Every structure is written in structure tokens, then in C-alpha cells.
């Protein structure tokens, strides 16, 4: 699986956690690849590096 992060660490396993940018680009990222936790994912907004 590949996400939109600069260094998508190509997470290869069953069950992958994703998060989408609110900042505009509306692209998807592996939560691992952007270093965020599920709580941070569901409770608050995420602005990616390009949309920041």
C-alpha cells in the first residue's frame, strides 16, 4: 500500500489505518507514515505538510 506521504514507508500488513487531509489537497495518508495516533485522527483535524 502506498500513501501520499513523501516517504511512504510502504506499510505491508493486514489492516491499515488511513487519515485524510482537511487542509485542502484531500489526499489520503497512512497514519503511521505521518506519525499520528487514532485518537488524534478521530478527535481533531489533520493538516498535511503541503496544506499547512
Amino acid at each position: 500500500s502506498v500513501c501520499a506521504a513523501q516517504n511512504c514507508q510502504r506499510p505491508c500488513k493486514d489492516k491499515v489505518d488511513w487519515v485524510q487531509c482537511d487542509g485542502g489537497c484531500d489526499e489520503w495518508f497512512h497514519q503511521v507514515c505521518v506519525g499520528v495516533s487514532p485518537e488524534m485522527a478521530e478527535n481533531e483535524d489533520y493538516i498535511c505538510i503541503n496544506c499547512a
Binding site: K15, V16, V19, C21, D22, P38, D45, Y46
Partner: peptide
């Protein structure tokens, strides 16, 4: 934000 889980 919007999250997703892929299996």
C-alpha cells in the same frame, strides 16, 4: 478528521 481502515 476522516479516517479509514483497509484490510
Amino acid at each position: 478528521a476522516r479516517t479509514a481502515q483497509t484490510a
